[PDB]
């Protein structure tokens, strides 16, 4: 902390770029909201997805119901040529407005020093952290503005959160549903229930 720097630097070059990046990271969110579209694609695809999800949940938790019923639907889905799967046949935006602005800055706020980082850095990285200076004697903790900008960028990622084919798919479902066990899995609940007591104390 051996140097004495103009306070006008603090005022007019530091706070501007702890602000700008914050408001730009907000605007990016709001504009992304305003940008995204949404198709009205088709009745066919939506229906097909819905039934595929019915199949998924069948394979997942089809083990709380009578066995014959599970097997009945499994047959309605797998039965040769009746089974449903055997009859139906058919970054950049992030990075770039952040890399274009660092350039503007380093073209604008160039010929001076900004601040100090309290952990010692490596020397080879000097010529790109200062970028205006012609001392080639300072330690590299004394940086230019661009580094402050990028540091702010990476540091304010986590503080916006706090303030805010068809046929093959069908056949794969069919194949993954062929191998399936009912496993009814309800066949001791009676005893388990009447094992210790009934539990209710909120009346």
């Amino acid at each position: 902390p051996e140097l004495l720097l103009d306070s006008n630097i603090r005022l007019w070059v530091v706070l501007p770029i702890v602000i700008i990046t914050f408001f730009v990271g907000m605007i990016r969110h709001y504009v992304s909201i305003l940008l995204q579209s949404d198709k009205k694609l088709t009745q066919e695809q939506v229906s097909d997805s819905q039934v595929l999800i019915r199949s998924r949940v069948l394979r997942e938790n089809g083990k709380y119901i009578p066995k014959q019923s599970f097997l009945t639907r499994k047959y309605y889905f797998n039965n040769p040529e009746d089974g449903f799967f055997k009859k139906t046949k058919r970054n950049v935006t992030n990075v770039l407005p952040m890399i274009l602005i660092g350039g503007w800055i380093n073209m604008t706020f160039s010929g001076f020093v900004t601040t100090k980082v309290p952990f010692p850095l490596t020397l080879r990285f000097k010529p790109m952290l200062q970028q205006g200076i012609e001392l080639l004697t300072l330690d590299a903790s004394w940086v230019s503005s661009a580094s402050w900008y990028f540091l702010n960028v990476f540091g304010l990622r986590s503080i916006y959160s706090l303030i805010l084919d068809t046929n093959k798919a069908f056949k794969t479902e069919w194949e993954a549903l062929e191998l399936t066990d009912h496993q009814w899995a309800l066949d001791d609940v009676e005893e388990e229930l009447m094992a210790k007591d009934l539990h209710f104390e909120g009346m």
Binding site: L4, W12, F23, L135
Partner: protein, 915 residues
């Protein structure tokens, strides 16, 4: 750079101390003329101290003026012991003709006219007499003094018409008179008369009426008079008829007037009888008649308007350095009712000692005073503002100076005051005070420093015994002091001993003066801010002092200690309190003195003891018949260096040897002849006395110029074998490892480092040379060069590097070492002083700011200069170009865009819901 061009630099220029002058140009247009000790000629403007043209020629005594004369539009100057004669124009500084004379002594000069014009001028040089024309210069004729070996011909006169007289005296035997006449060259009758009572007529007597000589004989208390045209066996009038006694131990003298060399002088004249006794008298053929006598007069001048002839008289009034001046009409004695000026000086012991007059014909008059110290004043016939202007010409010879920091604001004072529960409540109180101050909110006695201080009050001391204080930005003398009884040649040392960082404690500085004839010495202590002696009285030195050091160890009042060494090898410690004495009884044996005498060429080195005495420790000589020490240098104690090593090309390190206690010694030969001349260098340690390096550079003689910085050395000299100036540079490197990297005791290093060096050439000559400085040593270091033309040059040290590729390898290529620059260049793009040239430039001073990117420069010679330098482009100040309007036109753009695209997405989304 317009800003620095007009915000922080400046240049005062002076001429020195007036010997001669000449007023009363045609009416007197705006101007007057002087001819000073420093060989200058100036043409000042008589409404305000300001120069039209200087024509400074030569510092050293081969241009020193010996006489001066104004022929109403032009001037005449006789320099170099009678040899050279010049005429100027008095309008633009434009010379019109110069010539040279034979060898002589210039007994005197006069301006002769034959009957109605002034065509010729006359010169007397103790052997002959010369007579030249005015406009041409080309000699008219010379005659020879009849005997010219014992007479000491001391005076010329010409009462207008016809002819010329030449007058000489042997001390206590006789005088001879001679007459020549124009356009012959021939010696008219010469007269001799015996007069064994005078011993000179240089400053004794002068012609009064149309041939008439009158000289005083204090023996017989009378006046021996002579018509010089129609009488010999000179007459005598006893000065007892008039109660007009002489003084006891005086050489009384005579003051005539001759406003026209074509008409005779006037029959009224002045006598200086005693120091403060002046008499006006009048001469008829035999009847002397007193008109007035002045008993309390120090100074008087004659003057003459178109017809009238007047006498200005000076007097003290009663005291408090208050003088009065009055006019008198010479023909009568009658004082003129009006025209009493009354003025006063500000200093304590200071006397006018000189008075010149200018006269109007409204009737007006303006006076010029060269008071003692060197000061100059121009007084006008007014009441309210009587001093039209004042000119402080003592600064034309500066000796040593310093730059001191200003005092504090209130904020910082109470802040210091701010610094268990007592701690907390103290803090709170001070905070609440500053708070109330903020709420409430929203020249010698009111000045204080600013952030990144650049104001840096200056203290300069002067060969005439006059101390100053200046602001260092638009330099305005704020205070002055005068310490008396100071010879022309003495020796000063100026030490700073407590600065402005401890609010209740007042600063102080200290000054050591020698006398140079008796060896006596004096210690004056003061406060550099207001200019006042301090209350504490310094001790009285009995013996001749030799040297002194400053010893930054403090006392309980934050003051350094200033050890002084006697001639009988006994120490004196100025703040001699008990605390300091115990500190010394502890740490004395780590304090060493080194002394040097060039007469016999020997060096010595002493150390302290528990008590204050000195035991000789090392001793060393140099033969004074082949070596003659020129100067000795040592590192500035007030420097701090950042890096202990220099990174090599392949990420290796080369460590450097600092040796605080080192010193450089430079010598030159006795057998001066340009085949066998040589310059010697020695590098010594102050503690032990061992020579690190001992070098010789042959065929080189010249006046040298040296700099000895942190681990490098530079010296400039002159090569007689290719008749060119040269630079030579040294660097010291220990090696690749560190030897007790934390301590550096000089009693522990056996192994001596490796010297690198190199020699370049330089296309010009040199005057004072110095190096930049700033605390923390970070930024690049430059060399400030004073050329003879007055321009300053900033040279980068990194250009003078002994490790320069010299047909590079690839390591040097990587190390970007700029191989061996031939003929180190001079282009006028790095001159500080664009049109602010300094004339003689005996010296330079460089001081550090608080901003670490600026250095404060002061060039002192016959004329001052002051500025700031930026070795590395001011990296810690914002840009001096900032656009504060764009940035306040951007944030609002973004804030309103954010509000916009907040209220503009909530809505589109809501509308997506209720489609």
């Amino acid at each position: 750079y317009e800003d620095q061009v007009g915000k922080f630099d400046w240049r005062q220029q002076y001429v020195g101390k007036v010997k001669f002058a000449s007023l009363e140009f045609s009416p007197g247009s705006k101007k007057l003329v002087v001819a000073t000790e420093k060989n200058v000629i100036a043409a000042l403007n008589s409404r305000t101290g300001e120069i039209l043209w200087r024509h400074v020629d030569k510092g050293t005594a081969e241009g020193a003026v010996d006489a001066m004369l104004l022929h109403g539009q032009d001037v005449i100057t006789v320099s170099n012991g009678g040899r050279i004669m010049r005429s100027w124009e008095t309008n633009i500084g434009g010379l019109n003709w110069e010539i040279t004379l034979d060898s002589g002594s210039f007994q005197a000069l006069g301006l002769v006219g034959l009957q109605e014009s002034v065509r010729y001028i006359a010169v007397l040089k103790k052997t002959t007499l010369a007579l030249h024309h005015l406009s041409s210069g080309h000699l008219k004729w010379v005659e020879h003094l009849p005997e010219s070996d014992s007479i000491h011909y001391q005076m010329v006169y010409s009462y207008g018409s016809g002819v010329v007289w030449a007058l000489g005296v042997v001390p206590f035997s006789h005088v001879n008179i001679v007459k020549f006449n124009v356009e012959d060259g021939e010696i008219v009758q010469q007269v001799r008369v015996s007069t064994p009572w005078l011993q000179h007529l240089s400053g004794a007597c002068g012609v009064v009426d149309e041939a008439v000589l009158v000289c005083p004989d204090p023996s017989s208390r009378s006046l021996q008079t002579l018509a010089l045209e129609t009488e010999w066996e000179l007459r005598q009038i006893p000065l007892q008829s008039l109660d007009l006694e002489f003084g006891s131990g005086f050489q009384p003298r005579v003051l005539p007037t001759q406003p026209n060399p074509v008409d005779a002088s006037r029959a009224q004249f002045f006598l200086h009888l005693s120091p403060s006794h002046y008499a006006l008298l009048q001469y008829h053929y035999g009847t002397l008649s007193l008109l007035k006598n002045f008993p309390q007069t120090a100074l008087v001048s004659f003057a003459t308007t178109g017809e009238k002839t007047v006498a200005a008289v000076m007097a003290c009034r009663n005291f408090n350095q208050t003088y009065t001046i009055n006019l008198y009409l010479v023909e009568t004695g009658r004082r003129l009712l009006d025209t009493t000026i009354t003025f006063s000086l500000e200093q304590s012991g200071t006397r006018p000692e000189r008075l010149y007059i200018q006269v109007f014909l409204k009737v007006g008059y303006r006076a010029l005073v060269q008071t003692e110290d060197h000061l100059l004043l121009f007084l006008q016939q007014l009441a309210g503002k009587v001093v039209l202007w004042s000119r402080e010409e003592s600064l034309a010879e500066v000796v040593c100076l310093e730059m001191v920091d200003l005092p504090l604001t209130g904020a910082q004072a109470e802040l210091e005051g701010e610094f268990l529960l007592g701690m907390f409540l103290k803090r709170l109180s001070s905070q609440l005070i500053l708070l109330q101050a903020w709420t409430s909110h929203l020249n010698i006695d009111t000045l204080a420093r600013d952030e990144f201080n650049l104001q840096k009050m200056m203290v300069m001391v002067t060969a005439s015994g006059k101390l100053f204080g200046i602001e260092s930005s638009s330099g305005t003398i704020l205070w002055k002091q005068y310490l008396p009884n100071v010879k022309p040649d003495s020796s000063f040392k100026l030490m700073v001993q407590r600065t402005t960082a401890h609010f209740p404690h007042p600063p102080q500085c200290t000054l050591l003066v020698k006398d140079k004839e008796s060896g006596m010495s004096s210690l004056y202590v003061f406060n550099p801010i207001f200019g006042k002696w301090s209350q504490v009285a310094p001790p009285v030195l009995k013996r001749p002092i030799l040297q002194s050091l400053l010893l930054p160890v403090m006392d309980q009042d934050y003051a350094k200690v200033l050890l002084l060494i006697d001639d009988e090898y006994k120490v004196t410690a100025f703040p001699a309190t008990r605390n300091v004495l115990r500190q010394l009884h502890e740490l004395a044996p780590s304090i060493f003195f080194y002394l040097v005498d060039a007469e016999q060429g020997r060096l010595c080195g002493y150390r302290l003891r528990k008590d204050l005495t000195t035991e000789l420790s090392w001793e060393l000589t140099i033969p004074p018949e082949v070596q003659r020490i020129v100067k000795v240098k040592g590192k500035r104690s007030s420097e701090h260096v950042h890096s202990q090593g220099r990174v090599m090309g392949d990420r290796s390190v080369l460590y450097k040897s600092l040796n605080p206690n080192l010193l450089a010694v430079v010598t030159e030969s006795t057998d001066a002849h340009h085949e066998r001349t040589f310059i010697g260098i020695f590098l010594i340690d102050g503690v032990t006395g061992r020579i690190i390096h001992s070098s010789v550079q042959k065929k080189a003689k010249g006046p040298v110029h040296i700099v000895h910085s942190e681990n490098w050395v530079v010296y400039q000299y002159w090569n007689t074998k290719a008749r060119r100036n040269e630079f030579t540079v040294l660097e010291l490197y220990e090696g690749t490892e560190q030897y007790n990297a934390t301590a550096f005791s000089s009693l522990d290093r056996p192994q001596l480092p490796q010297v690198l060096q190199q020699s370049y050439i330089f296309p010009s000559s040199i005057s004072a040379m110095e190096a930049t400085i700033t605390e923390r040593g970070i930024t690049s270091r430059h060399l400030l060069i004073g050329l003879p033309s007055g321009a300053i040059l900033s040279l980068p040290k990194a250009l003078l590097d002994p490790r320069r590729p010299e047909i590079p390898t690839e390591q040097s290529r990587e190390e970007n070492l700029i191989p061996y620059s031939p003929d180190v260049q001079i282009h006028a793009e790095r001159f500080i002083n664009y049109n602010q040239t300094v004339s003689r430039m005996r010296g330079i001073y460089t001081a550090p700011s608080g901003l670490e990117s600026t250095c404060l420069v002061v060039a002192y010679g016959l004329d001052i200069y002051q500025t700031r330098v930026y070795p590395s482009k001011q990296f810690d100040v914002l840009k001096d170009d900032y656009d504060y309007v764009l940035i306040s036109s951007v944030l609002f753009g973004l804030v309103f865009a954010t509000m916009i695209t907040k209220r503009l997405a909530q809505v589109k989304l809501l509308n997506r819901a209720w489609r």
